[PDB]
Amino acid sequence: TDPMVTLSSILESIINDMRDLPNTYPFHTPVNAKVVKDYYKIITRPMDLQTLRENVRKRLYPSREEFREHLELIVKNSATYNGPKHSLTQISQSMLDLCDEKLKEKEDKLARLEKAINPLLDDDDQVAFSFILDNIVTQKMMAVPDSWPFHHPVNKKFVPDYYKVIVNPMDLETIRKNISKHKYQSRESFLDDVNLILANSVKYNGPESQYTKTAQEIVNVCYQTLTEYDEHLTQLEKDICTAKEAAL
Numbered sequence: 023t024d025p026m027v028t029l030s031s032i033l034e035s036i037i038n039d040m041r042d043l044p045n046t047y048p049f050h051t052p053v054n055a056k057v058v059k060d061y062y063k064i065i066t067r068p069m070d071l072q073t074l075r076e077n078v079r080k081r082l083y084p085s086r087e088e089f090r091e092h093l094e095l096i097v098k099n100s101a102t103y104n105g106p107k108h109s110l111t112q113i114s115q116s117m118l119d120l121c122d123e124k125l126k127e128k129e130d131k132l133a134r135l136e137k138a139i140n141p142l143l144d145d146d147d148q149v150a151f152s153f154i155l156d157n158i159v160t161q162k163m164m165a166v167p168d169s170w171p172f173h174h175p176v177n178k179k180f181v182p183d184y185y186k187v188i189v190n191p192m193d194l195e196t197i198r199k200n201i202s203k204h205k206y207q208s209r210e211s212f213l214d215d216v217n218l219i220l221a222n223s224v225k226y227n228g229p230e231s232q233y234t235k236t237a238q239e240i241v242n243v244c245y246q247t248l249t250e251y252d253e254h255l256t257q258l259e260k261d262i263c264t265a266k267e268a269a270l
């Protein structure tokens with residue numbers, strides 16, 4: 023019994039339960055951008071329950087976390103466009119709350135399916151590797167003075183032209199999310215994402231900007247810390263590759 027199918031049935035059931043909450047209809051289908059004419063000038067990642075359900079049916083979500091991240095976009099988008107206390111945002115939050123209740127009820131089953139879909143989520147070398155990477159991000163990289171521009175995705179509401187310049191955005195929160203999902207099996211992919219932050223700062227702010235000097239320091243402290251842990255990380259990467267091959 024394909025665990026991806028079972029998982030998808032649980033996620034669809036959660037969508038059914040949130041669709042049934044009061045006043046949720048404005049979130050059942052995509053915003054009509056020909057009626058809400060400025061919507062895409064403000065919102066970068068539109069999401070709604072129908073798109074979410076179709077993605078569940080396409081087997082696009084191998085775990086709770088990718089599903090929840092897309093569901094959370096509904097709330098974040100409403101908070102940005104409608105307002106943090108707007109009634110619509112409260113309604114969307116009520117759906118995220120119901121999702122979290124249901125995920126809590128089924129966490130052991132969901133964990134088992136997730137491990138069967140991707141055995142690396144249960145591999146102690148992958149877990150230790152991701153733990154080290156997360157600590158580099160939170161304890162070294164986010165500690166660079168005035169690194170705040172790079173901690174979270176740019177909000178197009180506050181920097182309206184940002185995404186006309188930066189089409190491949192990256193930030194430390196997204197990296198932490200990638201780490202939490204165990205996206206990185208070695209330092210190469212992690213450094214691809216770290217360096218994208220710096221490349222985007224060069225492109226948007228300029229090579230001589232103070233923003234770019236800060237981003238350069240973020241990248242440099244990443245290299246310095248990876249070098250300090252090189253030998254353990256090398257052991258973890260070798261054993262992760264071996265686990266990955268055995269999962270075949």
Ligand SMILES: C[C@@H]1COCCN1c1cc(C2(S(N)(=O)=O)CC2)nc(-c2ccnc3[nH]ccc23)n1
Nearest residue numbers: 170171172174175176177178180181226227233
């Ligand atoms: C564009 C600059 C330089 O490159 C990197 C991004 N960085 C940012 C990033 C962010 C956010 S966010 N969630 O606010 O969008 C924190 C994640 N905000 C601003 C901002 C917002 C309003 N007024 C501003 N004046 C000067 C800057 C500024 N700038």
